[PDB]
Assembly symmetry: C3
Homo-oligomer: 247 residues x 3
């Protein structure tokens, strides 16, 4: 046989490159996943991830309470934190023993898989009682924020998209929903009658994941890297696995 | 300049009236919210609200368990109340220490924003195991109850719609889902192929809110009134903010 | 009058047969329910049921954590079980006091009502972090498993469909979503524009039920049999109520 890495008959080499290319392009096919991660960062350094993986379109919807840090199996002062909720839903509306709950997110990162079309991204960053813009009567139910999404590049390939905003002020008390649609460069509407019921089933079939990791290092190591997910850390370091045309 | 309140050149006055009119009519545009509140009233006077706010259509789905009173951070006798659940799912099916759980709702109020079309309202008021009408085989999955919805009028304007039913009998053990569609007097189908994927995204983007307020006064003060929501209290008093054509 | 059971004028007899036939065929009409049960079996003999009942289509979506046994109001070692979660999401990723959590399901049974079309059934049996097939890039978001569904026959009638798989190995750590579409032998697309918004409302109106029964006997007695649901027990015994053309 020919010698490895010296000719066009390194079929092992060609097959490796095709395997990676097939995965990248399958993901971008209408058969492929579109994935969304919402990361809530807490002052103790831990990070809640909410993930959804689905065909055609994907989303996550959270309220003020559901974004708050919960240390499973540890003390979370639930009565006091309910009083925090009451005090955040209406000024002077509760009697907690604290001014600022350390369970409040300090920041949010939204990351999409590279199979999203950024022009379809929508976000409702609402107030603490789940209104998009102060009052329902004046609220568009979303903002289209795609132009703010940064490309996560690795080795010249887009491995994902990130929108990051901090919540450093005392009044940064939010509710949050996010939605994105899978790329479709064809003119075949996946939600027209020939395929519409499959998009309804995709709403059923969407897989969700949630966990609170004790720090960003642990998240990077045992979540992001373990499962070939894209990420951007606090030092602007990019994570992900480039696949198209690559060995 | 002209003197305030004496001529057609009170532009401040005209702008105020337009601001309010724009909010009312924006809410009724296809860009606007449609909102649903389900209020569960408990014997201790507290009130659970479940709220969802979304474009195009909106709904809430609850089971017997999820409607039960939960006092966050206080004693809820969870084992005993699981035995209540077992005893309510099947007669003589549990061993709780009580005949009637005070966590059971005594009444339900359903309120829609004025941007709902009442002809589209649907409700599945089911039994304790989440069947609409005793057995699945005979169950239509909803009832269309719009004709029972009362207009909440303030200053001659419809600020919302209410359907209220008490659950005063021991056998009033329910599951509950409710759905309504945003007004659309145009013939443009928001869920036809030109816009269908946006209605799917609206399912993602819908913002939800839940809280248990200690009484109806507190609910009126720090929830309803605070956020310009419609309401009807036990004394048939109407709450809401009239906007169309008004300063 | 004629004597009972001796002539074609036993109208009581004819009405009984029609009552049962009407229920069976109503269930199969587009007005009827389609229902899904996911049963998670635990080593202590208890069984979690997740049920959804809806028009047009139905589904259930669970993650690794949500399938785990929870004994309401009893000790569940929540910190230790969070460490189990960490150790199952990534090998050697936690520090629980155990090798195998007895809260892990030992098996799953999926049962559909007889009103499902088995060709529409889809399942995403994913890994512990809610990826269908190890990595998102290579994942079709479902498998179509209808050919594996067994008919639950009683008295020669199909009363439901079952797919059952055990999880007996230590590496059988899963996430799970399932979806099925209601029979529609007509060419009228229930999700084409004439009726599409009603299918969106059906997503709102779907009723859900969850409970953990202490054993299969109790499940059979107070859940399955009580509410005329189909079932298949560990001894391959079939349960359900035959209705079509029957008294
Ligand atoms: N492209 C490129 N890579 C370099 C160079 N010098 C060092 N490198 C490293 O080599 C890596 C690329 O190697 P290859 O993947 O084999 O080269 P390639 O440009 O991708 O070409 P093919 O994969 O064969 O089509 C990069 O990730 C760099 O870190 C250079 O001059 N050009
Ligand atoms: N319309 C009306 N309001 C009265 C009358 N007497 C007292 N009011 C009070 O005045 C309020 C209405 O005042 P306005 O809003 O300035 O009058 P309007 O009828 O709405 O007329 P415009 O807003 O200028 O178009 C009502 O809410 C009443 O409580 C009356 O005779 N007619
Ligand atoms: N069909 C049938 N059933 C039998 C026979 N012997 C005993 N059985 C029992 O009788 C039951 C059926 O009785 P029926 O329902 O009155 O008879 P059928 O065949 O359904 O006929 P119709 O309901 O009158 O149309 C079955 O469930 C059997 O358990 C037999 O020879 N033929
Ligand atoms: N020294 C080099 N000279 C020429 N091309 C390079 C070199 N290093 C990498 N490349 C190529 O440049 C392209 C972009 O790779 P690069 O490493 O810059 O991506 P990146 O990870 O986004 O970079 P960075 O994260 O440092 O901004 C790839 O096609 C890669 O093969
Ligand atoms: N004394 C009055 N004479 C004439 N018109 C009035 C008077 N008070 C209010 N109105 C007008 O009548 C219309 C209805 O207002 P009204 O106060 O009756 O509404 P409402 O809050 O639904 O009343 P209620 O709650 O007392 O039944 C409004 O256009 C308002 O401007
Ligand atoms: N002894 C019998 N002779 C003839 N027909 C019978 C007899 N018993 C039942 N049947 C008929 O046969 C058909 C199938 O009934 P059967 O009792 O076999 O259903 P099944 O409950 O699926 O059976 P099994 O669970 O024992 O496999 C029905 O129409 C029934 O009326
Ligand atoms: Cl494709
Ligand atoms: Cl419009
Ligand atoms: Cl029909
Ligand atoms: Mg290369
Ligand atoms: Mg006026
Ligand atoms: Mg018979």
């Amino acid at each position: 046989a020919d010698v490895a890495g010296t000719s066009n008959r390194d079929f092992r080499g060609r097959e490796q490159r095709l395997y990676n290319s097939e995965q990248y392009n399958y993901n971008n096919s209408l058969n492929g996943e579109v994935s969304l991660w919402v990361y809530a960062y807490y002052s103790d350094g831990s990070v809640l991830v909410r993930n959804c993986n689905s065909q055609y379109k994907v989303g996550i919807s959270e309220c003020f309470k559901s974004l708050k840090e919960v240390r499973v199996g540890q003390n979370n002062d639930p009565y006091d934190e309910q009083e925090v909720n009451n005090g955040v839903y209406y000024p002077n509306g509760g009697e907690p023993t604290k001014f600022h709950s350390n369970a409040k997110p300090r920041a949010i990162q939204i990351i999409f898989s590279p199979s999203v079309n950024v022009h379809t991204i929508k976000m409702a960053k609402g107030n603490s009682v789940s209104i998009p813009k102060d009052y329902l009567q004046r609220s568009h139910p979303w903002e289209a924020t795609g132009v703010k999404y940064r490309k996560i590049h690795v080795d010249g390939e887009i491995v994902g998209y990130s929108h990051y905003f901090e919540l450093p002020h005392e009044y940064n008390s939010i509710s949050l929903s996010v939605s994105g649609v899978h790329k479709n460069p064809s003119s075949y509407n996946v939600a027209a009658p020939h395929n519409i019921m499959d998009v309804f089933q995709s709403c059923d079939l969407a897989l969700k994941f949630s966990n609170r990791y004790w720090c960003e290092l642990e998240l990077i190591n045992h979540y992001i890297s373990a499962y070939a997910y894209p990420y951007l850390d606090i030092n602007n370091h990019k994570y992900g696995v480039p696949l198209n045309g690559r060995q």
